[PDB]
Structure 1
């Protein structure tokens, strides 16, 4: 049953046809400056395996790789493109990426290897990577015979599956989504990851020292107030101290013991001085372990840069995710944690950080899709949407909106986008279910178009079996027909939320593509560093700021044309923190 192929000792002409399935294997999960363990090529002339030392040193092979007219079909081309960038080799001509294709066809499948994608089309003549390389401590590259056949079988699957995947994408009217959006974005993300973000490690280290001091102080204060010492980090010793020794009330229970969520502690604060200290302790600890020590662990000691990896084929809504490190969840809400951003700086002298963010893109997308007259008019007037919502649901003039009213109207706006729920809104605003229901009821009275949309999108999900975004991304919702209330309700919220979060993802992704095209046309040195769902972070020479102030927001605002305007705010400074 073995698959035939040539284990070549040198590169030949027929290995360089203008159409081929290409495998450039990088086994390390984090592919930055990682080894390429083997190469496989399958084309009209046959199947070939090349040793990387040989192939990557061959002028003709390297030229073929960089020739845009020589088309390649691959799986996770970004992984290969980045691994090659670290070796000074350009990868061009990737016309089909099976990972991205499978992702667009059904993100729920969680396709993360060629075998998983192949199974979608009843093709099983290829092993899962885990089966070949093992996992964890036992992970390892097998001997050449085993490795070579696996890479050839993967290239063979890609070669065979391209047509069936493209045909289904076309039927789904997602072919342009793959070819004009996700694949071009893949190359942009590769450049971003490869460029990396410079880190002021000395500043982080100083913060770490100061935190260590405060942590020690607070820690001592906690033992003092508790009358003894214990591991504050343990959800058992703390449970005993709080709810047993100190007799604090048990307002919420996890599943295995006492719950100590920040929300639970906030309520217990009035009863004992130890509570506030525990909260403070955790927040400092969160900064220290995750944003100081954790960040320092992944900074490259030679360049002092962190090279995140944007997973482009993971989220069920079309958003990207970020890992090692996650640069999409850096503190900003609280000043103490916000200071962490002072550590992210430009990669060159006299360059600055430029950050642009969409203003309420999700609610603007909702206004567009629901065609709600009131919500559209609000954005056409560019009103403070939370104040406007408060005015409508509480029936008062702008001058009469109090801070608490705006705060609650804001929580309603979030609930509406997430997939409204009286129970969910109740928990969030610490109020009763009927009280939350009253708010929701008032909201729909003020925005009947939104109510219509929520009712209709749910019915549509049931009829078609899936919901779609502006650019045709889709999410299947089988649980929408479940006879279990909780399971069905979750699917209904997904039906309501996915077209919104997903369409916002579509828009910023297109904005990134348009932006890069503009930066190149203008020959600006400015380049993208990060994307955080509704914001783009760039770095550029100080001399380019004025041009960026006009170019970036315009490109982002014009990415798509909706029934309401899109608005983009921007700021720039010496550090990410200052780009406020």
Structure 2
């Protein structure tokens, strides 16, 4: 049952064909500066396993890796590329990435190893990585014969599966999406991760000192007001103090017991002085543990940088996610929190952070796809979209829009951009399900084109089995036909939301590719550091700011041509915080 291969102790020319499946195995979850445990090559001449100390010290092998005209098929090529970048080796000529191919074919499969991709085409001659490496504490690299066979089987699966994946992509009109968008983006992301983002650890540490002291003050005040010490961070213990000792009313239960969420506690504040102090404690503790301690833990002491990993094959919308650290949820809303962004600084002296963000990209996409005359007109006039929505829903003039009217309109706009239920909108606005339904109804009378689009997109999802984005990304929605109402409704909302959010993701990904090309053409030293859904963050010499002010917004604005303009705001400063 053992697949034939050559366990090479030296590199030979027949290993360096100009078309090959390549496995460069990094087993550590976080691949930054991580070991490469083994290498496998499959090509028309046979199957080969190479030890990394052998292969990666071979000038011919390394040149082969770096020759763009020697084509390679891989799985998760960014992992390999980055691990190699840390060893000073460049990987080029990756013409097919099976991870990204499987992701585009069906993002809900959750394909995370070669075995899971292979299964989609009834190929099972490869083991899941979890079966070979083990799980958790038991995770280990096996002995060489077991390792070697695994890597060769992965490589053989890649070799076999390229053709059928490419054929289905083509049938779906997704072949360009793979080859011209996701794969090129993967190289750009690899560069971004490798560059990293410099952190002023001293400033974070001082902030942590300050928080630590404010926490101790509040924590003591909590115990005074409770008349005893307890674990504030245990919703169980807190529940007993609040709802039993202090007899506060129970406005919401959870599966386990009593809810202690911020929104419940906010309704309880008038009853007892402990509640505000709990909320304050939760806010500070969140900052301290998730953003000060959580960032400090993942700063590389060697670089003084954080090197995130972007997961390009996770979301069902096509958005990127970010880990270790997650840089897509750094506080912005509250000033105390926002100050965390002061710790993200340029990696060189006399460089600055430059940030550019799309203004209402999701609603502008909606205008374009729905062709709603009112929404299209609003963006053609570059109106404040929330004020304009308030004017229409409440049928008032601009100077009759009150702050609460605007807040409520904005909540409706948010519910559209994120596909939330009427229940969700109700929770968000602290109103009844019924009143939420009336708001939504008023919206559709002002934007009948959006209503029509919603109805049409759901019918299309029902007919075809899936919805698509501008750039041909697909999401299958088998629950759209369910008889469970909550199940069906969620799927209908995903039918509505996905073309919106997915198309925005498509646009920014194209912008990133276009921007990388232009930065090179223009000979700038500016580099992309991060993407945060609708914004791009770069660092550059201070001497490049004026050029980037013109360059970056134009590249982002012209990424696609919609029925409405795209608009990009930008800022720069000495820290990410100041780039506001």
TM norm structure 1: 1.00
- CA shift at 1:491, angstroms? 0.3
- CA shift at 1:223, angstroms? 0.7
How far apart in 1 are the matches of 2:232 and 2:465? 47
- CA shift at 1:437, angstroms? 1.2
How far apart in 2 are the matches of 1:13 and 1:219? 68
- CA shift at 1:420, angstroms? 5.3
Give SS of 2:303's match.
Answer: coil
How far apart in 1 are the matches of 2:507 and 2:579? 23
Q: Comparing 189-198 with 424-433, which one deviates more in the overlay? A: 424-433
- CA shift at 1:2, angstroms? 1.0
How far apart in 2 are the matches of 1:28 and 1:540? 32
Q: Deviations over 1:354-378 (max 9, x none)?
A: 0000000000000000000000000
How far apart in 2 are the matches of 1:201 and 1:497? 39
Q: Deviations over 1:543-564 (max 9, x none)?
A: 0000000000000000000000
Give SS of 2:123's match.
Answer: coil
Q: Deviations over 1:336-360 (max 9, x none)?
A: 0100000000000000000000000
- CA shift at 1:303, angstroms? 1.3
- CA shift at 1:308, angstroms? 0.3
Task: Map residues 431-442 of structure 1 onto 2, 5 A cutoff.
Answer: 431-442=431-442
Q: Deviations over 1:440-493 (max 9, x none)?
A: 111000000000000000000000000000000000000000011110000001
Give SS of 2:241's match.
Answer: helix
Mapped contact 1:419–1:492 kept (Cα < 8 A): no
How far apart in 2 are the matches of 1:552 and 1:227? 58
Alignment match, 2:465: 465
- CA shift at 1:422, angstroms? 2.4
Q: Deviations over 1:147-182 (max 9, x none)?
A: 000000000000000000000000000000000000
Give SS of 1:233's match.
Answer: coil
Alignment match, 1:343: 343
Alignment match, 1:393: 393
- CA shift at 1:434, angstroms? 1.6
The runs of 4+ residues in structure 1 deviating greater than 3 Å are none
* CA distance 1:254–1:420, shift in 2 (3 Å): closer
- CA shift at 1:421, angstroms? 3.0
How far apart in 1 are the matches of 2:340 and 2:552? 25
How far apart in 2 are the matches of 1:40 and 1:18? 15
List runs of 5+ in structure 2 lacking aligned partners: none
How far apart in 1 are the matches of 2:525 and 2:216? 45
Q: Deviations over 1:159-210 (max 9, x none)?
A: 0000000000000000000000000000000000000000000110000000
How far apart in 2 are the matches of 1:455 and 1:88? 53
Alignment match, 1:315: 315
Mapped contact 1:115–1:126 kept (Cα < 8 A): yes
Give SS of 1:362's match.
Answer: helix
How far apart in 2 are the matches of 1:418 and 1:391? 22
Q: Deviations over 1:414-453 (max 9, x none)?
A: 1122335322211110111221111111100000000000
- CA shift at 1:502, angstroms? 0.4
- CA shift at 1:248, angstroms? 0.9
Q: Comparing 453-462 with 427-436, which one deviates more in the overlay? A: 427-436
Q: Deviations over 1:96-118 (max 9, x none)?
A: 00000000000000000000000
- CA shift at 1:310, angstroms? 0.1
How far apart in 1 are the matches of 2:420 and 2:449? 15
Mapped contact 1:248–1:271 kept (Cα < 8 A): yes
How far apart in 2 are the matches of 1:320 and 1:129? 23
- CA shift at 1:69, angstroms? 0.3
How far apart in 2 are the matches of 1:416 and 1:445? 15
How far apart in 2 are the matches of 1:418 and 1:359? 16
Alignment match, 2:251: 251
Mapped contact 1:17–1:70 kept (Cα < 8 A): yes
Count of paired positions: 580
How far apart in 1 are the matches of 2:176 and 2:363? 26
How far apart in 2 are the matches of 1:557 and 1:127? 45
- CA shift at 1:228, angstroms? 1.1
How far apart in 2 are the matches of 1:567 and 1:499? 19
How far apart in 2 are the matches of 1:235 and 1:212? 21
How far apart in 1 are the matches of 2:27 and 2:282? 37
How far apart in 1 are the matches of 2:459 and 2:286? 43
Give SS of 2:100's match.
Answer: helix
How far apart in 2 are the matches of 1:148 and 1:432? 61
Mapped contact 1:198–1:344 kept (Cα < 8 A): yes
How far apart in 1 are the matches of 2:432 and 2:141? 57
How far apart in 2 are the matches of 1:48 and 1:466? 41
Mapped contact 1:418–1:496 kept (Cα < 8 A): no
Mapped contact 1:10–1:54 kept (Cα < 8 A): yes
Task: Map residues 200-239 of structure 1 onto 2, 5 A cutoff.
Answer: 200-239=200-239
Q: Comparing 52-61 with 236-245, which one deviates more in the overlay? A: 236-245
Mapped contact 1:73–1:97 kept (Cα < 8 A): yes
How far apart in 2 are the matches of 1:545 and 1:157? 48
List runs of 5+ in structure 1 lacking aligned partners: none
How far apart in 2 are the matches of 1:566 and 1:416? 19
How far apart in 2 are the matches of 1:497 and 1:116? 27
How far apart in 2 are the matches of 1:423 and 1:522? 50
How far apart in 1 are the matches of 2:418 and 2:49? 49
How far apart in 1 are the matches of 2:474 and 2:323? 24
Q: Comparing 555-564 with 240-249, which one deviates more in the overlay? A: 240-249
- CA shift at 1:577, angstroms? 0.5
How far apart in 2 are the matches of 1:146 and 1:435? 63
Give SS of 1:298's match.
Answer: coil
How far apart in 2 are the matches of 1:421 and 1:85? 45
Give SS of 2:297's match.
Answer: helix
Give SS of 2:247's match.
Answer: coil
- CA shift at 1:267, angstroms? 0.8
- CA shift at 1:273, angstroms? 1.1
Give SS of 1:331's match.
Answer: coil
Q: Deviations over 1:193-235 (max 9, x none)?
A: 0000000001100000000000000001111111111110011
How far apart in 2 are the matches of 1:53 and 1:542? 42
Mapped contact 1:204–1:343 kept (Cα < 8 A): yes
